[PDB]
Amino acid sequence: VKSGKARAHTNIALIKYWGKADETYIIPMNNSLSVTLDRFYTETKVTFDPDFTEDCLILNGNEVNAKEKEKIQNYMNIVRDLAGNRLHARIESENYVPTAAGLASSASAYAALAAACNEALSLNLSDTDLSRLARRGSGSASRSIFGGFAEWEKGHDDLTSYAHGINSNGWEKDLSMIFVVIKVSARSGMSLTRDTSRFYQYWLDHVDEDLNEAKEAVKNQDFQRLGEVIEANGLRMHATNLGAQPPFTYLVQESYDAMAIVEQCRKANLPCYFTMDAGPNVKVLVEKKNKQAVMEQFLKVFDESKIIASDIISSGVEIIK
Amino acid sequence: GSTGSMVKSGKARAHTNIALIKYWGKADETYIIPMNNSLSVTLDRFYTETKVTFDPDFTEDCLILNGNEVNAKEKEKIQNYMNIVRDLAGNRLHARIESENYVPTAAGLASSASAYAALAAACNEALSLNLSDTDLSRLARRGSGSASRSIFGGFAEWEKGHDDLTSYAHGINSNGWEKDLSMIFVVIKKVSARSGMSLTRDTSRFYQYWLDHVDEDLNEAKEAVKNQDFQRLGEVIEANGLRMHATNLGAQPPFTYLVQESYDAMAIVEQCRKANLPCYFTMDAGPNVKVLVEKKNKQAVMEQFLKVFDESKIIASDIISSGVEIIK
Numbered sequence: 001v002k003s004g005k006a007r008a009h010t011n012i013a014l015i016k017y018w019g020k021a022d023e024t025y026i027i028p029m030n031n032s033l034s035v036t037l038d039r040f041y042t043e044t045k046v047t048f049d050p051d052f053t054e055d056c057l058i059l060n061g062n063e064v065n066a067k068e069k070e071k072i073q074n075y076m077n078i079v080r081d082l083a084g085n086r087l088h089a090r091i092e093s094e095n096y097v098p099t100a101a102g103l104a105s106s107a108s109a110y111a112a113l114a115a116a117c118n119e120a121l122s123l124n125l126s127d128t129d130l131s132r133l134a135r136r137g138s139g140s141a142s143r144s145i146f147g148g149f150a151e152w153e154k155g156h157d158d159l160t161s162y163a164h165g166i167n168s169n170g171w172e173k174d175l176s177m178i179f180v181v182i183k184v185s186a187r188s189g190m191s192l193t194r195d196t197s198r199f200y201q202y203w204l205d206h207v208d209e210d211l212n213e214a215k216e217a218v219k220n221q222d223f224q225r226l227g228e229v230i231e232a233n234g235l236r237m238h239a240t241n242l243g244a245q246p247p248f249t250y251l252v253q254e255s256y257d258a259m260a261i262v263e264q265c266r267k268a269n270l271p272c273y274f275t276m277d278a279g280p281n282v283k284v285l286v287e288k289k290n291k292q293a294v295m296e297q298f299l300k301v302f303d304e305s306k307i308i309a310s311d312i313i314s315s316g317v318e319i320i321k
Numbered sequence: 322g323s324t325g326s327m328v329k330s331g332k333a334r335a336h337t338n339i340a341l342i343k344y345w346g347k348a349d350e351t352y353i354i355p356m357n358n359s360l361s362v363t364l365d366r367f368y369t370e371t372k373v374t375f376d377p378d379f380t381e382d383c384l385i386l387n388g389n390e391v392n393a394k395e396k397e398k399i400q401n402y403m404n405i406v407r408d409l410a411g412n413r414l415h416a417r418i419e420s421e422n423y424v425p426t427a428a429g430l431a432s433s434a435s436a437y438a439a440l441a442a443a444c445n446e447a448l449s450l451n452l453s454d455t456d457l458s459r460l461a462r463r464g465s466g467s468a469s470r471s472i473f474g475g476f477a478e479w480e481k482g483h484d485d486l487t488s489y490a491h492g493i494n495s496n497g498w499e500k501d502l503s504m505i506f507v508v509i510k511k512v513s514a515r516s517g518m519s520l521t522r523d524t525s526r527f528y529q530y531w532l533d534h535v536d537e538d539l540n541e542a543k544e545a546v547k548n549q550d551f552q553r554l555g556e557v558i559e560a561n562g563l564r565m566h567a568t569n570l571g572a573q574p575p576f577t578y579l580v581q582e583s584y585d586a587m588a589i590v591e592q593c594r595k596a597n598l599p600c601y602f603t604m605d606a607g608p609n610v611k612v613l614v615e616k617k618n619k620q621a622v623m624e625q626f627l628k629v630f631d632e633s634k635i636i637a638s639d640i641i642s643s644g645v646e647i648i649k
């Protein structure tokens with residue numbers, strides 16, 4: 001019997017990953033830039049037993065649905081292949097996330113699993129190969145191998161497509177992300193758009209410049225500059241969905257109300273910037289020093305229970321005991 | 322009806338139009354000069370009838386809308402517009418304006434294009450200004466940009482120009498193609514069009530993108546019309562309409578006119594399209610989805626929407642060939 005346990009934190013893309021060059025190995029049309037969150041994470045124990053017939057997944061104490069179970073059994077086949085064994089595993093996982101708030105991620109799930117399998121089967125995988133392993137489950141999991149700022153380099157094959165951590169001289173310790181809590185999966189949404197969106201080329205033509213400008217801002221620890229490019233990049237992502245055949249949107253009116261509050265804060269000498277993912281939740285990057293002030297502005301309009309802050313964590317994926 | 326010797330009245334009926342290539346954002350806010358050309362179709366079903374009566378006794382302009390007094394705000398608005406008319410006609414006469422909107426305004430359809438075209442034409446008739454169509458378009462434009470196109474029937478294009486003299490629309494001869502087409506309206510506090518286009522135009526991060534493709538879209542559409550190629554016209558206009566709404570997403574801060582139900586209707590259009598009912602949608606300053614379809618398939622497409630939308634919510638109109646007309 002072989003076993004290991006790890007904690008992986010979710011991460012939010014500032015420069016978005018959106019569209020796969022390759023659906024089976026999960027290679028992206030473009031690089032992406034994320035920050036890892038202190039507050040939301042997944043803890044996953046994996047246990048390999050010669051007696052097991054088929055992989056079992058218990059999440060938060062309950063069993064998973066067809067699609068996940070299947071999704072997990074295909075992923076574990078990849079693990080088996082890599083390990084060179086034929087062992088099925090009982091997986092017990094726990095999401096540390098505000099309940100039923102749309103904030104559970106494949107990113108934390110798969111990074112945690114990859115690192116737990118790594119530990120269980122003693123593979124001593126390099127961070128690079130761990131990221132690659134996580135990428136095969138969910139693209140954004142590639143980045144949750146790392147803390148702080150991370151970049152997923154798209155590469156062109158299974159070997160070259162992986163994330164790496166970015167040193168910002170501890171800039172991440174100065175930043176925070178406020179969540180405003182407010183259904184098409186990212187996988188399905190993004191493939192429709194990657195395949196059919198009339199505005200997809202426009203996305204591809206600007207993503208690299210945004211990326212470079214984002215990465216440059218990080219080197220200089222220049223918040224306003226980072227803020228503006230990621231905000232624009234973010235909106236361009238949702239634009240591409242408007243061009244889809246047929247169009248769709250992740251956003252609802254409340255999402256826009258939150259956006260408007262972010263703009264006012266800037267006008268009130270409280271710099272912050274928003275982004276949205278595959279849902280209407282609005283995420284607000286802000287400096288720690290201004291975090292409380294910005295939150296107060298939201299509390300005027302949103303319920304206290306819906307305004308949830310998190311720090312950016314510096315460390316990466318972590319084996320547990 | 323009967324009019325005293327020293328009173329000049331005129332009454333006109335102008336039809337609403339829907340932009341297939343969108344006007345969105347002004348170069349000049351005071352004279353209403355657009356940042357780009359637009360192209361539209363004039364709808365047979367929806368129109369405004371406006372009567373105007375000039376009387377030397379009248380001390381100020383009066384506006385009666387669908388039988389009721391307008392408030393002081395809209396009153397003040399209409400008096401400033403009529404000043405333009407007075408300046409043009411070289412008089413100082415005031416008028417009583419009796420207008421009736423036969424447009425589903427409560428349902429969200431815009432009345433601004435027909436209202437201002439009707440008013441312009443009505444005045445030209447009352448005062449005998451002998452205005453050319455070009456000059457009628459220019460006068461309607463001062464009131465609302467889209468109004469410049471409602472002077473004309475069928476397909477019409479607003480040439481943007483660079484000043485008050487050069488910015489106006491004309492009718493496009495389509496060899497009668499307008500007679501084969503129809504538009505279906507799926508009916509679903511609004512930022513005004515004027516207000517909305519201004520925020521996007523001034524601040525939108527994606528506005529340049531709009532500007533970089535509008536002329537190409539327009540040429541493709543116009544070439545589509547010359548060819549009477551419904552697919553070619555439909556694809557470019559659908560994309561154009563979507564790009565306009567995209568710009569709004571890039572505004573500071575963003576907004577949208579679309580709701581989930583709008584998206585639902587679009588889905589049904591694409592469905593009809595995959596099922597050999599060719600049609601294409603567009604949206605203006607609100608959630609209503611408008612569906613361009615050939616008159617033959619109108620009935621079929623409607624039924625598909627009727628599978629999910631309330632019968633009262635689905636309303637078709639043909640496209641009318643004639644332009645603004647004076648009436649009794």
Ligand SMILES: O=C(O)C[C@@](O)(CF)CCOP(=O)(O)OP(=O)(O)O
Binds near residue numbers: 013015026277278
């Ligand atoms: O995370 C980002 O960069 C952007 C998004 O969050 C925005 F919605 C997408 C997440 O993608 P994911 O769930 O990883 O897709 P998968 O590869 O199909 O599993």
Ligand SMILES: O=C(O)C[C@@](O)(CF)CCOP(=O)(O)OP(=O)(O)O
Binds near residue numbers: 342345353433514
């Ligand atoms: O009609 C189109 O080209 C597209 C739109 O309808 C989309 F919302 C804009 C209409 O603008 P309008 O009411 O004419 O503005 P005004 O000049 O400020 O009065």
